[PDB]
Design a binder for this molecule. Structure first.
Ligand code: NDP
Ligand code: COP
Length: 186
C-alpha cells in the first residue's frame, strides 16, 4: 500500500481545466515538477502508482503515455479493456486503492498519487486518514470549466517549507506561481 497524495495546478479562481485542456500556456517547470514528484520513490526499487480519470489520461500527448517510471492506472465506468498503454483500468477509485493492498502490489508500489481529474480529487479528499495535497497556485485567473474543490483550511493544514519543494514564487512567461503542500491527518 503506502502513501496517498494528490497533486493539482490551479488558477487564482480555482480553475483546473478548459476544453479537455489546461487553461494557461504550458509551464515546463511545473510539468518538470509534476514529473519529479510523481516519479520519486522513497525506498530504492519501488515505483510510484498514479491514478487518473479517463479524460485526464487522453490529455497527455499520445507521445507521453504511459508516464515512464510510474504505474499508470485509469478509472472508467465504461471502457472494458485498459486504454492503449495504460497498465491497469479500474471501475472505482476504491478498487484502485484495494489494488495496492494486494501483496503483489504491496511490495512493488511506494506512493500513490491522485493526479486528477475533478471527481477523483473530491472522493480522494473525503477519504479518511492521512492525505497530502500538492497545490501549484498560478497567481492569475484563467477561464476554466472544471474546478478544484475548495481547500478546507480548518481540515487542511498548509505546511510551511516541506522537503524537496521550492517554497518560492516562480515565473515562466509572465505567469507567477508557487508550490504549496497541505496536509490533513484525521
Ligand atoms: N491543471 C491540472 O492540474 C489538471 C488539469 N486537468 C484538466 O481538466 C480536465 C479533466 O477533466 P475531468 O472532467 O475532471 O475528467 P476526468 O479525466 O476525471 O475524466 C472523468 C472520466 O473518467 C472516469 N472517471 C473519473 N473519475 C472516476 C471515478 N471516480 N470512478 C470511475 N470512473 C471515473 C469516468 O469515465 P468513463 O465515462 O470513461 O467511464 C468520467 O467520465 C481536462 O481539461 C484536463 O486537461 C485534469 C487534471 C489535473
Ligand atoms: N501540478 C500538476 N498537477 C497535475 N495533476 C497536472 N496534471 C496535468 C494533466 N495534463 C498533463 C499533461 C502532460 C503531462 C506530461 O507530459 N507529463 C510527463 C512529463 C511532462 C514533462 N515536460 C515537458 O514539458 C517537456 C520536457 C522536455 C522537452 C519538451 C517538453 C515539452 O512539453 O514541450 C511526465 O513524465 O510526468 C502530464 C499531465 C498537467 N499538469 C499538472 N500539474
Amino acid at each position: 500500500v503506502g502513501s496517498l497524495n494528490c497533486i493539482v495546478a490551479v488558477s487564482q479562481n480555482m480553475g483546473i481545466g478548459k476544453n479537455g485542456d489546461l487553461p494557461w500556456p504550458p509551464l515546463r517547470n511545473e510539468f518538470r515538477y509534476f514529473q519529479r514528484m510523481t516519479t520519486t520513490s522513497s525506498v530504492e526499487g519501488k515505483q510510484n502508482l498514479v491514478i487518473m480519470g479517463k479524460k485526464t489520461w487522453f490529455s497527455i500527448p499520445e507521445k507521453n503515455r504511459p508516464l515512464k517510471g510510474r504505474i499508470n492506472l485509469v478509472l472508467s465506468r465504461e471502457l472494458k479493456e485498459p486504454p492503449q498503454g495504460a497498465h491497469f483500468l479500474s471501475r472505482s477509485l476504491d478498487d484502485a486503492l484495494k489494488l495496492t493492498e494486494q501483496p503483489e502490489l504491496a511490495n512493488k508500489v511506494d506512493m500513490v498519487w491522485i493526479v486528477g481529474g475533478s471527481s477523483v480529487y473530491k472522493e480522494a479528499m473525503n477519504h479518511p486518514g492521512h492525505l497530502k495535497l500538492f497545490v501549484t497556485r498560478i497567481m492569475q485567473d484563467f477561464e476554466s470549466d472544471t474546478f478544484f474543490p475548495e481547500i478546507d483550511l480548518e481540515k487542511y493544514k498548509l505546511l510551511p517549507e516541506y522537503p524537496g519543494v521550492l517554497s518560492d514564487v516562480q515565473e515562466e512567461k509572465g505567469i507567477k506561481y508557487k508550490f504549496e503542500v497541505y496536509e490533513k491527518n484525521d
